[PDB]
Amino acid sequence: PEMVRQVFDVGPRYTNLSYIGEGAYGMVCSAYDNLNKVRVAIKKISPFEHQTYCQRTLREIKILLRFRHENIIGINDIIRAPTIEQMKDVYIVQDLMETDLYKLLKTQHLSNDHICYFLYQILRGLKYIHSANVLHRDLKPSNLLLNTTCDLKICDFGLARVADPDHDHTGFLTEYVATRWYRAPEIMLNSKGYTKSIDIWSVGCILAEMLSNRPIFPGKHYLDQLNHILGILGSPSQEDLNCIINLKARNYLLSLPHKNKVPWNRLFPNADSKALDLLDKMLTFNPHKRIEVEQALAHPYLEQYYDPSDEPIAEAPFLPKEKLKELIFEETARFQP
Numbered sequence: 539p540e541m542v543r544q545v546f547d548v549g550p551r552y553t554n555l556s557y558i559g560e561g562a563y564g565m566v567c568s569a570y571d572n573l574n575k576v577r578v579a580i581k582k583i584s585p586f587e588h589q590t591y592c593q594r595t596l597r598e599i600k601i602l603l604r605f606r607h608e609n610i611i612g613i614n615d616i617i618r619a620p621t622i623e624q625m626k627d628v629y630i631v632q633d634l635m636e637t638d639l640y641k642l643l644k645t646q647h648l649s650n651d652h653i654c655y656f657l658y659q660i661l662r663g664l665k666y667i668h669s670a671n672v673l674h675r676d677l678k679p680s681n682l683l684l685n686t687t688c689d690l691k692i693c694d695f696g697l698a699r700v701a702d703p704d705h706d707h708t709g710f711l712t713e714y715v716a717t718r719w720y721r722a723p724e725i726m727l728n729s730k731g732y733t734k735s736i737d738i739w740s741v742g743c744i745l746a747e748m749l750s751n752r753p754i755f756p757g758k759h760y761l762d763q764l765n766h767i768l769g770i771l772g773s774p775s776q777e778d779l780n781c782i783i784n785l786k787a788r789n790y791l792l793s794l795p796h797k798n799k800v801p802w803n804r805l806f807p808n809a810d811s812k813a814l815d816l817l818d819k820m821l822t823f824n825p826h827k828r829i830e831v832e833q834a835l836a837h838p839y840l841e842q843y844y845d846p847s848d849e850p851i852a853e854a855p856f857l858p859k860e861k862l863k864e865l866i867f868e869e870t871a872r873f874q875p
């Protein structure tokens with residue numbers, strides 16, 4: 539069995555391995571697909587020793603196998619042992635992508651043309667996800683893969699859920715898992731993140747980051763995240779406060795000194811004015827006034843690309859660690875032998 543840096547037990551179909559980077563649950567390599575005569579990406583996942591790892595693994599596999607969209611990464615193949623007792627790892631094979639938006643923003647200035655194209659592809663993929671009544675819940679630059687000609691594909695649905703807006707309300711300072719800098723303000727106030735507006739906020743943060751190569755709200759701890767957001771948007775209006783019925787949440791906002799909005803064109807003086815109009819509508823404080831994905835696609839900033847007949851939707855809407863391993867075994871059976 540081939541070894542890298544750790545057994546990489548993917549033969550014989552896949553050979554000529556090359557380390558790419560560490561992942562949540564193991565190694566990511568490129569490898570030559572001796573069947574399709576192309577290099578692919580392979581992710582080694584060793585999750586069976588922790589329930590939370592098994593949850594994220596089953597979610598990714600189940601959703602990505604059901605989804606088929608040009609802007610969403612596919613699963614080409616899954617490698618594991620023939621029996622549950624012998625299965626200690628799972629290998630997910632995907633198209634090989636050159637980079638991701640996180641690594642790209644580290645070193646590359648984006649032209650306005652690239653920003654517009656990236657944002658269109660993000661929203662086009664998100665239209666399909668939301669059409670299936672699914673929330674991604676962890677959109678951020680490192681979960682946006684790019685190939686050598688700047689085709690973009692959303693990946694990592696490990697925290698994704700079915701939308702559940704009737705159960706979205708919670709108390710003030712409720713704990714949350716998804717990446718801090720991309721959390722909507724209502725997560726810190728009264729929301730579990732069970733509605734589609736949680737994803738639009740993240741896309742808004744991603745657009746701001748594309749405009750300046752710096753995360754717009756780099757909060758350093760839970761509550762600091764909310765105070766970063768308020769420092770740019772300014773104090774919420776009386777109407778937006780009155781939508782927050784929870785008293786601990788509302789009284790915290792009331793306790794803060796008045797802060798004025800920072801104009802987007804001051805924060806991003808080189809930005810296209812239409813880009814900043816859309817940014818404003820995505821980074822709206824009140825989640826019920828925040829723009830939806832299909833409205834965002836129809837915004838003048840994206841008029842070069844907008845074609846709703848070429849922006850498809852899904853055909854239909856979409857635990858102990860021992861038990862999750864069983865379901866992972868069964869979900870991956872279609873790729874055997």
Ligand SMILES: C#CCOC[C@H]1O[C@@H](n2cnc3c(N)ncnc32)[C@H](O)[C@@H]1O
Nearest residue numbers: 559560561562566579632633634635638
């Ligand atoms: C798991 C995980 C996240 O970090 C994974 C490393 O794998 C990378 N990566 C993940 N999927 C692919 C992929 N499909 N093609 C190329 N590189 C990839 C990611 O950009 C990073 O370099």
